[PDB]
Amino acid sequence: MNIFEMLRIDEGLRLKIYKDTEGYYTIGIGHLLTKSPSLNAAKSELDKAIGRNCNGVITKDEAEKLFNQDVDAAVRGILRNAKLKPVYDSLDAVRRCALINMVFQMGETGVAGFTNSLRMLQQKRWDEAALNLAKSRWYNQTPNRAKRVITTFRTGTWDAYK
Ligand SMILES: [Cl-]
Ligand SMILES: [Cl-]
């Protein structure tokens, strides 16, 4: 199991513009287009993103290209982020994937705000960190996905995904 396979499981794949769990305009593999209510604002960002006239529809390849960029951006952001880098460096391979998973989902800014949880992960206090992460709007809104990531952190294995 790898990061791409993990996120493909959590985000799904859709070739037509759609609304995410939060109501925002998304396409492909969790690729957020805009927070704006307008489908037109979305369709424009989409053509900007692909470099063609899409009229809200893309190919598998295009969805994958976008997915490649996003995971990459997610990894570079963690590495560049002063609060995230140290946690990431302190972690094993599996748990590293889990942190990338949250960053792709909520952005660098959101994860960086989970101060207490980050501190417990860095300290390797698994169980405590798992209970703390569950106390968030994130877990309340997408419980099944949150549980999967959280177990990944608690255990250090791909069990939740297999
Ligand atoms: Cl809460
Ligand atoms: Cl969910």
Side-chain angles (χ1 to χ4, degrees):
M1 171 96 16
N2 60 49
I3 196 51
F4 292 92
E5 284 165 6
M6 191 200 200
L7 284 162
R8 165 79 171 77
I9 286 163
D10 276 343
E11 304 284 352
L13 167 62
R14 312 204 43 198
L15 305 197
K16 178 101 241 283
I17 295 195
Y18 74 85
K19 293 179 190 208
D20 81 14
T21 86
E22 296 288 356
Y24 317 131
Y25 283 129
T26 312
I27 200 154
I29 310 142
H31 180 85
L32 173 75
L33 286 168
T34 190
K35 288 184 181 160
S36 137
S38 169
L39 174 70
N40 284 302
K43 268 145 108 137
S44 148
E45 281 305 298
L46 173 68
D47 291 334
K48 182 169 41 102
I50 298 318
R52 84 192 183 40
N53 257 71
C54 286
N55 189 38
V57 160
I58 63 173
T59 75
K60 200 179 160 89
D61 283 23
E62 279 161 5
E64 277 168 1
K65 179 142 213 223
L66 296 177
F67 188 25
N68 284 335
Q69 304 167 169
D70 297 346
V71 173
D72 187 59
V75 168
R76 290 185 276 92
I78 281 166
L79 296 163
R80 254 205 275 120
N81 180 294
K83 261 105 166 299
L84 298 174
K85 186 184 204 300
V87 189
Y88 190 93
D89 298 326
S90 77
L91 295 174
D92 59 273
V94 191
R95 302 182 161 90
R96 272 179 186 170
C97 286
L99 186 65
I100 296 171
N101 192 305
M102 302 181 73
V103 169
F104 184 90
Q105 191 186 353
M106 57 203 134
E108 178 193 336
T109 307
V111 181
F114 288 46
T115 298
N116 312 316
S117 301
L118 299 175
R119 186 193 82 261
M120 317 172 192
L121 291 159
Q122 181 155 15
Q123 297 179 88
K124 306 190 184 278
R125 289 160 146 70
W126 316 127
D127 293 27
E128 317 153 53
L131 298 169
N132 180 273
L133 281 155
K135 290 171 180 122
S136 49
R137 182 196 201 257
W138 168 69
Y139 184 83
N140 287 102
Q141 295 327 108
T142 44
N144 286 335
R145 162 180 208 158
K147 281 181 212 152
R148 291 199 287 278
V149 172
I150 292 169
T151 280
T152 301
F153 272 134
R154 207 197 13 99
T155 85
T157 61
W158 292 114
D159 298 347
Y161 288 85
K162 297 153 342 208

